[PDB]
Design an enzyme around this catalytic site. Structure first.
Site, PDB file in Angstrom:
ATOM      1  CB  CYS A 126      10.491   4.744  12.186  1.00  0.00           C
ATOM      2  SG  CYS A 126      10.761   5.334  10.498  1.00  0.00           S
ATOM      3  N   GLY A 162       9.102  10.128  11.234  1.00  0.00           N
ATOM      4  CA  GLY A 162       8.671  10.136  12.629  1.00  0.00           C
ATOM      5  C   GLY A 162       7.741   8.982  12.959  1.00  0.00           C
ATOM      6  CG  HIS A 173      16.098   3.678  11.649  1.00  0.00           C
ATOM      7  ND1 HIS A 173      15.188   2.777  11.140  1.00  0.00           N
ATOM      8  CD2 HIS A 173      15.471   4.854  11.881  1.00  0.00           C
ATOM      9  CE1 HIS A 173      14.026   3.418  11.106  1.00  0.00           C
ATOM     10  NE2 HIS A 173      14.152   4.677  11.532  1.00  0.00           N
TER      11      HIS A 173
HETATM   12  O1  LIG Z   1      12.245   5.409   5.717  1.00  0.00           O
HETATM   13  C1  LIG Z   1      12.520   6.200   6.606  1.00  0.00           C
HETATM   14  N1  LIG Z   1      11.614   6.999   7.217  1.00  0.00           N
HETATM   15  C2  LIG Z   1      10.261   7.024   6.826  1.00  0.00           C
HETATM   16  C3  LIG Z   1       9.726   8.096   6.125  1.00  0.00           C
HETATM   17  C4  LIG Z   1       8.422   8.027   5.675  1.00  0.00           C
HETATM   18  C5  LIG Z   1       7.689   6.883   5.950  1.00  0.00           C
HETATM   19  N2  LIG Z   1       8.183   5.830   6.617  1.00  0.00           N
HETATM   20  C6  LIG Z   1       9.444   5.915   7.047  1.00  0.00           C
HETATM   21  N3  LIG Z   1      13.846   6.320   7.037  1.00  0.00           N
HETATM   22  C7  LIG Z   1      14.306   7.538   7.716  1.00  0.00           C
HETATM   23  C8  LIG Z   1      15.009   7.235   9.012  1.00  0.00           C
HETATM   24  N4  LIG Z   1      15.945   8.300   9.391  1.00  0.00           N
HETATM   25  C9  LIG Z   1      16.888   7.828  10.423  1.00  0.00           C
HETATM   26  C10 LIG Z   1      17.833   8.937  10.807  1.00  0.00           C
HETATM   27  O2  LIG Z   1      17.126  10.094  11.272  1.00  0.00           O
HETATM   28  C11 LIG Z   1      16.220  10.575  10.267  1.00  0.00           C
HETATM   29  C12 LIG Z   1      15.230   9.508   9.859  1.00  0.00           C
HETATM   30  C13 LIG Z   1      14.807   5.322   6.728  1.00  0.00           C
HETATM   31  C14 LIG Z   1      15.630   5.463   5.612  1.00  0.00           C
HETATM   32  C15 LIG Z   1      16.404   4.391   5.191  1.00  0.00           C
HETATM   33  C16 LIG Z   1      16.385   3.190   5.887  1.00  0.00           C
HETATM   34  C17 LIG Z   1      15.580   3.082   7.006  1.00  0.00           C
HETATM   35 CL1  LIG Z   1      15.606   1.613   7.937  1.00  0.00          CL
HETATM   36  C18 LIG Z   1      14.785   4.122   7.434  1.00  0.00           C
END
Ligand SMILES: O=C(Nc1cccnc1)N(CCN1CCOCC1)c1cccc(Cl)c1
Ligand SMILES: O=C(Nc1cccnc1)N(CCN1CCOCC1)c1cccc(Cl)c1
Lengths: 304, 304
Positions: free
Chosen positions: B145, B143, B41
């Protein structure tokens, strides 16, 4: 989201751990620049611990009696001195992995990470607090002496603790890196009982703010209190008195959440008086006090 | 003595963390040999997350669009491929700090350490468990991830988790290092509810053995039970069924303490039925399930 008992990344400290052996005793040492720091009881046997005269025991030791091994390579000891309850072993090689560092003496209520080691090798890392009775509730076995406690500010490691001793009650005592014990403890196998382990009120409040930031809000009530009223309750429950300095340090957490510090104190007062009623806060069934207000802001903002 | 939620020393993993940026999205990557692993992602914007076609989004990306920075130096991307939910970025330089490593897919109930990172920089380390519903209860912000979960066996790091997502309930989902999610989760901003978070029975028993080894013995009773009787109680309390494989794995802890596994099950049964009555075990007011039998032996013996 989520809130965990988080330790600092330990890599910078792992590069400093060495094994120190004197006669039959082996413990850990901390190698920074050309000096290896370790508990002075490395010169004792279990029998010497009863009433050791460290100056007298040290007279029988020469540089070649201190065996210092970093990984699998031997360091050459070119000097040795005693500073309070630590020995400083001057070696002929500066530790190439020496990070930027400071030696700090912490106050009770402050938290730090511990890198538990055995034979100069790291076993694990966990988060501790210097208790109000100057003990720490760690996880240490025989051989763990010389393991250190530290905090990190970007690239600077502030070392605050060196493990020396376990009390008969299973709690731990140690020194700062100048070799001065925290609290009244002495490096002797003698009757040393810890005082009242009171709860670190300012840390519990910081953790309640962390709970609110993470969605755990059931404990918020319709009440407020004053410092004096709250403190009457805190005394009854063996909590540290809350001061205006503690209220001031909670300012950023209060501003972020919109919950006035005294309103959070009233939530805490009801929790002390009524208990949790089988409920939990941030996965805990008790009020956690080993997160400082700074730890909460750091974890909740993602400081690296 | 003392028993703590201990993480592995994180140094070996800190040397692998890098920052990966694609367009406006920045997350963490894991650099091992000449490959950088990161969540796929990274190629999306928050708007793309609603229903992303990763193969289609990836067609618009070239090697020069993936910006990989290790510390303050840029790595040259010479290849990119997608494996399940991770991207593998081939770089022209092998990570000189690559430790001995393996990629493992863990089972629910197994524990691991997480090195939470932001912008390729480590923020902290904590211990997690893969829950029976295939979520983890971590501490992650936007951030984080690409932060990884791992175990260490002397000098070999077994990577088991890469963080991808937070569910609306504040729990976390991610993949193994082959990019396969644990559980049924998908890398999409869609309604994904976690199943029953049951308690890891074998871990609770291991932790009760750790409590006995450390002097916390008030919960030991005069009773015994059978696997079938214990399991009737475990089902009622949303505990995982205990099997003879779990009893066998508790064998060394049973031998060390002289407390038969089924006798410990009867103590656990009374604790479930009667509660703690305001008492604590190893500083906890609830039954801890994020220590495996192996974690207990390791911490209680001082394995480095
Ligand atoms: O969960 C997420 N982030 C998160 C936040 C707090 C703690 N752990 C993780 N995200 C956000 C990712 N987006 C991608 C684009 O740029 C902005 C960030 C997410 C949302 C849906 C599906 C997936 Cl795989 C990931
Ligand atoms: O507490 C200790 N060790 C320990 C054990 C478990 C957890 N944390 C620490 N010791 C033992 C030190 N002795 C020195 C001689 O060779 C054998 C080991 C100790 C005993 C009394 C005073 C002091 Cl300062 C230290």
């Amino acid at each position: 989201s989520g809130f965990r008992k988080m330790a600092f990344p330990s890599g910078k400290v792992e590069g400093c751990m060495v094994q120190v052996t004197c006669g039959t005793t082996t413990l850990n040492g901390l190698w920074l620049d050309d000096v290896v720091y370790c508990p002075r009881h490395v010169i004792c046997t279990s029998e010497d611990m009863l009433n050791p005269n460290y100056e007298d025991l040290l007279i029988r030791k020469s540089n070649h009696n201190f065996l210092v091994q970093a990984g699998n390579v031997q360091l050459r000891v070119i000097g040795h001195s005693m500073q309070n309850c630590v020995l400083k072993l001057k070696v002929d090689t500066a530790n190439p992995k020496t990070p930027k560092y400071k030696f700090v003496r912490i106050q009770p209520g402050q938290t730090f990470s511990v890198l538990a080691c055995y034979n100069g090798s790291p076993s694990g890392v966990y988060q501790c607090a210097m208790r109000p009775n100057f003990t720490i509730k760690g996880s240490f076995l025989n051989g763990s002496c010389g393991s250190v406690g530290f905090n990190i500010d970007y690239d600077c490691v502030s070392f605050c603790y060196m493990h020396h001793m376990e009390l008969p009650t299973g709690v731990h005592a140690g020194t700062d890196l100048e070799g001065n014990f925290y609290g009244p403890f002495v490096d002797r196998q003698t009757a040393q009982a810890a005082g009242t382990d009171t709860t670190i009120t300012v840390n519990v409040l910081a953790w309640l703010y962390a709970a609110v930031i993470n969605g755990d809000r059931w404990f918020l009530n319709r009440f407020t209190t004053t410092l004096n009223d709250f403190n009457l309750v805190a005394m009854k429950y063996n909590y540290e008195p809350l001061t205006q300095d503690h209220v001031d340090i909670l300012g950023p957490l209060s501003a972020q959440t919109g919950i006035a510090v005294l309103d959070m104190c009233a939530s805490l007062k009801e929790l002390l008086q009524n208990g949790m009623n089988g409920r939990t806060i941030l996965g805990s069934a008790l009020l956690e006090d080993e997160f400082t207000p700074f730890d909460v802001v750091r974890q909740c903002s993602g400081v690296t």
